[PDB]
DNA sequence: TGGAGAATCCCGGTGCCGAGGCCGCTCAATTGGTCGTAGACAGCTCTAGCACCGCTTAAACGCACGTACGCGCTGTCCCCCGCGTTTTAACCGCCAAGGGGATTACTCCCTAGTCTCCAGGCACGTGCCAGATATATACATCC
DNA sequence: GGATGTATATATCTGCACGTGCCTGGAGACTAGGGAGTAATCCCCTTGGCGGTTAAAACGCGGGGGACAGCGCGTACGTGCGTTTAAGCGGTGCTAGAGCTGTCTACGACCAATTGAGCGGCCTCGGCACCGGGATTCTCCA
């Protein structure tokens, strides 16, 4: 049972992702909000990926399931088949 | 000694991480997070490596776009520092 | 002879709100709502059949489309109502 | 031939199983359509219509009216979180908007 | 010609009052007119394409409904 | 007598959010629709339901945009909306 | 086994840039682009055929799907090569 | 019989007309598929492929590279307005972002 | 404004692994003929859309006061950036088990297709109940 | 404490729901064939483990800069009132053209034989990642 892996998305990783977004200065309460946003987004994609897995009667979540889940939410991903 | 002014290393990092294409989150903690999230839906579940790679690419792109909108919201309030209210404003205007 | 869901939404409305009527624009809205939800669920089931190399739409595909489309409690109660409907249709 | 019992009657439904089956067949969704798919789909549509009509009837009785107008449907959809999530990109004609004023604008 | 001025200042004021706006700048109205012109240009262009595909010279409500549904602005109540 | 600046605005907010009626006059919007459609095809006809559908969609879109504009004005500690708030709302929405 | 637009986009690349190659990931992304645009145009043409009560997808359906989906200059040019290719196919 | 001339060869195309035709038949789009529809669709797809590939080759040449990587495809799509409008809700994997530092963040 | 330390840009050498080309084959595109039906075209009709007129009246428009409020300036102090050192776990290489995804054979039940037939659903018609309107009183806000 | 917006209550009038005849589409009943379930197999590939190493995260500390509160000021919308104007409602009329029906014919589905283009497998070489050293910005402080 995996517990408390949201702290693995570290403050330097969120700082790097803000650097790619063009952010010069970052507050200290940004990281908890970014972790919550990431958890909500990953829950939304992973629920549809698991649903696509369970419809195919498989025990593995394939990349094409994640591509279908992301194409569902208008976030189509290029490079993992389709 | 030598100490740079606050902001120069930030702009150098902005140029460095906008010139590059590497994933900015470590792969093993993201993988553990994906298994922890997916264990709440179906237990005893496996993942392809390309599935976790697709999840990482999508999550990083979504967070980078969110931080761009957050920076726009921070500039709109006569600031250069991003705050959680900017994230909340960007997400409610997007409709999430 | 345009077909519509007018008498059926009449029947559901009188089944749950007996002393309550409905207007013409409201029934145009409800007909559009039923058609839109039908198109969403049928399109998601068509995609689900095409992804799994299947040429038929069964109760499993429409159930998965309901789970993909509807939010949590709505999806749970729609799954429960439809499973009750399929079991009653097969039992009779 | 025996008595013609409809597929909606033997399933205990009000929406037509046969019409839903016909629109599934000629809608170019799949090459084949199973027997339980129109029954399941008409049950789901009947449930969603029932939920909308429950909340719209409550909104109509809140405005002291016994006839459901589009404003009552709009209040019904947007006052529930799941129905607002399902109908987020949907504009209801003659529905208006809900009364919301931000707290910084009050005196 | 010059029919964008028919969307008057009190019309934009009423539209913002329905949106909850308490105070409105004087440069809001030209911006809102440009926004309305861009939105109407997109929907009308798509509806005209749907009309001329059907070899008709009359823009129906069905064309406007499909033009709005193409852009994720689905409208209930006009035959959808 | 004279009312304070803001109370008639709040009364209008409470009035127009309680109604469903179209806030734009019908004939100027119809003339604007026929002026815009002249660039795409010469000598076009319109059903009345088409112009009514266009007016309902345009009014709903403008009301939602003014809600996001009001959020953007409040985020910069203002009660007055400005064109930069409209531009920021359309930028975060993806329309610019 | 698996089918993809691998050799064709390479042929187009050597037609356009004869001294420029491609990688495998850029190949998969271009294949996904062709598949997604094909799905968009074919779905729009299916919807256009269903709206006008037609059971046939013709070149007119693809033409108005390109006009609906692609932006302005892209749509005008793509209509021009589509019409040119259909004219060359019918004439020979 | 005669020589088996490819439908793409008599249409002046590089994309396969027959594969677009089988994908239109088996994709559940209509009961009937016309003859000129796959020719038109293959021409449109080939034009869009060439439009992305020309700009991606230009972006690869501007970065002193021979082969095309997903960074060059991302730069080609995002630097063209019509391609960014077409591909706006699509993430290119290993593509990165455009270099864009805001004017109020630069030092004076 | 000059100059020191840090960072960035640029050129030559080395290896590696992934792109690019060649070959066998196989399955899927092509070719040729047949057939049934979808759609193109012609005719008609009657429906709704456009064009104009008159009035009356609500709403748009011009203008004046003035007050709140957007915006610029100043202080302060706390919070976050930069850098150094320690810790920790990510990452790479490798090595095994073993679940499970993918393929093949078969076999059966499920669904397309067709003929017949009757009952549900739709268009038409009517008459009656639910809101819209108008006016006086008191409740609720406003300054 | 006085002055206005607005529930609240009563009459009144007009523009959704029930009934019915036709009709057409769903249902009963039967056949045929092929799509998917099920069992078996096998081999990719996913997970779990160990160890070294080293790169990145975490903690601490100094300091500076920017977020935030306060304050003045000048101006630009809010509000109100008189004037103008054209939206809107009702009416008339006329012709485009949307929509339905009928006929015929071209065209796409379908089937069978043929054959060649594309895909898997394999081999090899050059584009490029990396490293090291020097030339050129480049930022900050005297």
Author numbering:
A (entry chain B): 21 to 102
B (entry chain A): 38 to 133
C (entry chain D), G (entry chain H): 30 to 121
D (entry chain C): 11 to 117
E (entry chain F): 23 to 102
F (entry chain E): 39 to 134
H (entry chain G): 11 to 118
Task: Cite, word for word, the article reporting this structure.
The engagement of a DNA glycosylase with a damaged DNA base marks the initiation of base excision repair. Here, we report cryo-electron microscopy structures of nucleosomes bearing a deoxyinosine (DI) in various geometric positions and structures of them in complex with the DNA glycosylase AAG. The apo nucleosome structures show that the presence of a DI alone perturbs nucleosomal DNA globally, leading to a general weakening of the interface between DNA and the histone core and greater flexibility for the exit/entry of the nucleosomal DNA. Mechanistically, local distortion augmentation, translation/rotational register shift and partial opening of the nucleosome are employed by AAG to cope with substrate sites in fully exposed, occluded and completely buried positions, respectively.
